[PDB]
Design a binder for these strands. Structure first.
Length: 51
DNA sequence: CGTTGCGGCAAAGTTATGGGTAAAGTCACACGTAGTCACCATAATGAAATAAGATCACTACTGGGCAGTACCAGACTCGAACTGATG
């Protein structure tokens, strides 16, 4: 969940829209989002930065 | 009474009108009358075009299951051995 948080943070810092697919594409095991909390963490980070 | 003017009566005289008959005029036969633009509405296509419809391609969002792992016994089966009856 942390790693997803820095991934979305860096992606928005560069300028690209941080989506689920883009975040997955740069994380070694892009299937962990089936966990009911990692996706929640990603959505919470997006809402915190405003999506 | 003799004369003179006036008026009725009935042919007689003059116009007019619708008929008939010969005789002076009249006029077409002379290759010829049909013939020709101008006119604006309606059908009637064929082309021009439609306005919507159909499909491709991409982007993002969110359900959500499969190969595999793991335990706790219950229960049947049977090596291996124990032990009793017997001919």
């Amino acid at each position: 969940c942390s790693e997803v948080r820095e991934i979305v943070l860096s992606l928005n810092a560069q300028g690209v829209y941080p989506t689920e697919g883009r975040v997955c594409e740069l994380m070694p095991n892009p299937g962990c989002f089936r966990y009911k909390q990692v996706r929640a963490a990603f959505n919470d980070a997006r809402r915190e930065f405003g999506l």
